[PDB]
Structures are given as structure tokens and as C-alpha cells.
Design a protein around this ligand. Structure first.
Ligand SMILES: *[C@@H]1O[C@H](CO[C@@H]2O[C@@H](C)[C@@H](O)[C@@H](O)[C@@H]2O)[C@@H](O[C@@H]2O[C@H](CO)[C@@H](O[C@@H]3O[C@H](CO[C@H]4O[C@H](CO)[C@@H](O)[C@H](O)[C@@H]4O)[C@@H](O)[C@H](O)[C@@H]3O)[C@H](O)[C@H]2NC(C)=O)[C@H](O)[C@H]1NC(C)=O
Ligand code: CA
Ligand code: CA
Ligand code: CA
Lengths: 213, 217, 213
């Protein structure tokens, strides 16, 4: 049975949507496949679209995943690790601002370690993207929530920028931040990408997606 | 197969489905129904039977349409009175109503029990006690009243509440909530004909999002 | 075995949405059923809603289908042919403008031939709707894309009006054109329907759908 969204694209599924794939050890899982972007075959593990879901959540919630198939979600750190663990695949970040303006940014490999390793971000080459690089900064850094401080700052970046990310001191990207809708006076606590629209602009749409090498 | 399966969205949550979305359950009588499960709110496991989000669907509809259900899995819908009765007839389901205004304020109401009688009793609302909620109690008023639509006036008003207030609801004489009213988008001059909740944002403010959902005790 | 969205309606599915049906050839297809409009039971094969999907696409892409179950899509010419081949189905076209005024056109029968015949369009007589008739003009003409010009123009109409359609010389409807959002100065390159809002108005919503005659 189908193991990646790439497989499903290969089996003639051309419309984006939720399909079940089979995890290394046989667990059925409905993932969102993006069959459209950049050749198609992407498995989406994060999406922000309308601010209907609260992303300011604790460790246990990020671990198992949350949100809605109808709109916004986070697939879950366990699932994300399961998907990008054995073998390797690439990350694609997509961003649309409120004027209908598209930008992206691909890297050539992406993986997160398991819970014992605090979901460490393993990130390689920024290939290209109109949105620029604002994610390598966070390379080799442990995942943080508001109730598990594993960050580089002396104070809690997750709580400060209202999100859950691979926080150092602190961040150039904050895609799990608050849905602030465009420009905001508050500093760096929205759906922000430094090299893209900056620390005071919150995107309308964000998607993080992977595809096998 | 209609044994094996999940009977409520609560069952599906317990079976490790963590993302909200459309799943098929089996009603007390094995009939399989595809429902929207809210796995996120207040512990998760809610079956959503009403959803207003963007005004794309007309809720000003006749009796037959409310009976079988209408709208879209992609956006707004009413599950259908038959289904709603089937879902709530045996047992106690708590009810929760979730509301969001256009300035991003979120409000809710919660009730100990909720059930609607069958068609012969005109989908009579049987409402348990108000338990808590920022939105305030604007449903207790409608306890023990028949459902009404534009073409079937079962209210306690000499007029037709469903025509005056452009919805369908368990109107009394006439209302304190009108969640199936017109999608008027925020404050409106017209009186009480929007997606209104009296103790919430009053008779002149129509919310951006409303959801009604149920879950086993 | 449900063969059409009409079948699903008769079996008591009253909410519009994506359901899987079985084609005359037995392939299972997941389609958008419109259970609401004009008695319900329509299978939607084209949907424009917000301009999120690029419809300016090549032959291979139109053949297999593209877009998203969450928003805009084209079911795919192969699928459309498979759904229209045997018997005959009605066609309804629904159009919404930016003040939410709805229009429609309705045709007794509609079918597209297969790839060998270039998905040639076989349309029956105009029945009533208020949008007027802007498809009859296109009867008996192959489908053209930017990369497969089958029109009756010395140029490439798909390139001239940036869509893909049964172009003659050139068109009176262009529902796969650019999502230009209301009135546009450019000529006839939007989601246009001549007898509806003319060559300089691009609709907000467009849907093409079929149902057993
Ligand atoms: C729910 O509300 C009803 C009244 O509302 C109607 O019924 C409900 C189900 C909805 O369909 C509404 O839309 C309808 O409008 C209450 O019913 C009344 O209850 C009171 C007692 O609490 C009854 O009053 C008693 O009547 C006795 C005589 O009863 C018989 O005769 C009357 C006519 O007078 C007749 O209506 C009734 O059915 C009997 O046939 C009298 O001896 C006693 O002392 C007292 O006055 C009243 O009769 C009921 N009205 C009706 C129409 O039945 C429900 O009790 C209420 N339920 C709950 C759970 O609160
Ligand atoms: Ca710290
Ligand atoms: Ca009356
Ligand atoms: Ca030509």
C-alpha cells in the first residue's frame, strides 16, 4: 500500500486532499497530499490558513498533532519523525500574504529526531525561494513549547513569541506563531519569516511539506 | 461492520483520531452517517451538527430541508433533524455552542444535556441545565418548544417567528438565540434576524462563526 | 455500487461534498457532489472560487486533472469523458459575481469525446438559464491548451486568452481563464461568459456540473 504522497501521485491521484498512507510499521494515517505544487507529491505536515485553530499549545499536544482536516493543523511530532526518519526527503515552505502574493523556499533534506532527542531539527542546503532563508538559522536546534523549555535564550521564546518552534536566541522564523493577519506592531510573535516579510507581518497562508529524495 | 465501528466522535477520539474532520459513525440503528468531529475543543470528541462560517449557504429553508439536512462538508451545514434526533435520542449528550465575532472574540455556552424529539413531536427541544460559558445562557428560554421553519409555524407568537427573524429555530415568543438566521456579518440595524445570541453580542450583531455540537456525558 | 452523485443523493446523502463513485468502467473516482442546486445530484467537474489555483496549464495536466478538493479544480478530461461517454448527462453552469448575484445556464446534454478526438465537445440545446447561452458557439470543437493548439485561429487562442477551452476563433466563454476579480481592462482573458457579464468581467465563482439527463 501507498507509503508517501509521492506514491499516490504515481498511482494516478491528481487532486490534493487527505489520503491514508502506511507508516513504516503499518500504521494507517490520513495525511494531506499536495499534488499541485512544484511537481506534486508533497505530504503537508503544517498549515495555517485562517486563524481558526490555536497553535499556542503544550508539548503533549504538539507530540500527537492537532487541528482540523478542514483547515489548519499540525500533523504531530511523532508522525513527522516517523515520516522523515528512515530514508530522507526534502522540505518546502510555502507563504501567501494578504495581497495574494506567493513566495516559497526549499531545502534539500529535512528530518526531526525522536522525542528522546527532543525532535531535533536536521536541516541542509537552502536550494532557492523567493521567500529567502529564515530557517537554517534554527538548524541543529531542539523543538520547544511553552511547557518544555529546550531553547537557547535565558527566557522562554515559545511563551515570548507565542508559538512552538526550534527556538534559539530566539528565531528568524515562527510559523506556529499567532495568526495576526498582516502587519502587526508586536514583535516577532506572528506567523513570521524574517527573510520574507519580516518580524511584523503575519502571513495568510503557511504550509510546510516534505517529499522523498 | 456496523458493529466493529465507532458510534460517536468520542469513540473515534479514543481510537486515536486526533485531527478534526469528517468521519463515518454508526447511529444506534446501524445507519452509517458521515459527521464532522471536533477533536480539538474542550477535550475533543464532539459531533458538530451545525456550522456557520462564511455565509455561503442559505439557511432560510423549509421543513423538508431541515429534516434531511443541507449544506456542504467544505463549509456550512445543518446535519438534519432526523440525524440530530437519532444522535441524541438514547443517552445523554452534552451540548456546546461555540461563537466567534468578527473582531476575533471567542465565546461559548455549555449545557448538561440536549436532545431533540422526533418529527411526530416536532423535533421538540429537551434542554438540560446551563453549565457554564462566556456567551451566557441564551438557549434555556427555548426549552420544551417545537422546531419552526418558514413554512411550518409551531411558535407561541401570533405571527411567524421564522419569517420575522429569517431562520429556523425552536422559537417561543419569539427568541433569544437565532443561530440559523441570516449571515449578516457583524453589527446590523435590522432586528434580531442575524446569527444572534442575546446574552452574547445582542440582537444586532451577527457572529462570524457558530458551531453547535454534542458529546456523550 | 453508486455510479453518479445522483445515486448518492437517492441513497440519502444530503450534504454536498467529496464522495467516491464508480465509473462505467469500474474505476473508483472521488468527485464533488452538489446535493443542493436545482434538485441536487450534480457531479462538479470544474470549480473556480478564489484564484488560488493556476488554470493556465498544459495538455497533460488538463488530461489528468488538477487543483484541490479544498477549493478550485478541474476533474480531468479523461474523467470527464468517462463520466459523459455512455448515455447522456445534463450540463449546468453556475456563475456568481462579486456582489453575489447568481446566474446559470443549462443544456439538455453534454459530452466530451476521448483524447483521440481531442476531447471534442458535443453539446445539446440550450435550456433556460439567466446567464444566456455562451457554449453552443463552441460545439463540435476540440479542446485546446497552450501546448496543443487545435483552434481555428492562425495564432494560439489559449495563449491569447490565457486558458484552456474548446476554442474556435476564438470564444464566447472562457471559464478556465485567469481569475481577474471583477471588471478588467484586458480583453476576454478572465473567467468570462459573453451573454452573462460580458468580455470584461471575471466572475468570482464558476462551476460546471453534470447529472443523468
Ligand atoms: C412543555 O410545554 C407544554 C406546553 O407546551 C406545548 O407542548 C409542548 C410539548 C410543545 O409542543 C409546545 O409547543 C406546546 O405549545 C407543557 O404542557 C402543559 O403542562 C401543564 C402542567 O405543567 C398542563 O397543565 C395542567 O393541565 C391539566 C389538564 O391536562 C389536560 O388538559 C389540558 C387542557 O387543559 C391538556 O392540554 C393536557 O394535555 C391534558 O389533556 C390540569 O389538570 C393541571 O392541573 C394543569 O393545569 C398543561 O395541560 C400542558 N399543556 C398542554 C398543551 O399539554 C409541558 O408540561 C412542558 N413540559 C415540560 C417538560 O416542562
Ligand atoms: Ca530559556
Ligand atoms: Ca405563530
Ligand atoms: Ca491555431
Amino acid at each position: 500500500g501507498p507509503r508517501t504522497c509521492k506514491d499516490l501521485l504515481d498511482r494516478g491521484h491528481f487532486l490534493s486532499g487527505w489520503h491514508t498512507i502506511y507508516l513504516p510499521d503499518c500504521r494507517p494515517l490520513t495525511v494531506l497530499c499536495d499534488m499541485d505544487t512544484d511537481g506534486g507529491g508533497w505530504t503537508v505536515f503544517q498549515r495555517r490558513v485562517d486563524g481558526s485553530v490555536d497553535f499556542y499549545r503544550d508539548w503533549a499536544t504538539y507530540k500527537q498533532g492537532f487541528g482540523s482536516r478542514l483547515g489548519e493543523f499540525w500533523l504531530g511530532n511523532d508522525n513527522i519523525h516517523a515520516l522523515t526518519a528512515q530514508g530522507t526527503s526534502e522540505l518546502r515552505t510555502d507563504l501567501v500574504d494578504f495581497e495574494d502574493n506567493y513566495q516559497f523556499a526549499k531545502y534539500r533534506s529535512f528530518k526531526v529526531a525522536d522525542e528522546a532527542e527532543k525532535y531535533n531539527l536536521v536541516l541542509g542546503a537552502f536550494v532557492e525561494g523567493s521567500a529567502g532563508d529564515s530557517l537554517t538559522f534554527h538548524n541543529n536546534q531542539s523543538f520547544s513549547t511553552k511547557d518544555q523549555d529546550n531553547d537557547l535564550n535565558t527566557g522562554n521564546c515559545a511563551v515570548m513569541f507565542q508559538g512552538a518552534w526550534w527556538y534559539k536566541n530566539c528565531h528568524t522564523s515562527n510559523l506556529n506563531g499567532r495568526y495576526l493577519r498582516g502587519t502587526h506592531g508586536s514583535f516577532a510573535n506572528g506567523i513570521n519569516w524574517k527573510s520574507g516579510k519580516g518580524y511584523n507581518y503575519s502571513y495568510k497562508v503557511s504550509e510546510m511539506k516534505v517529499r522523498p529524495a
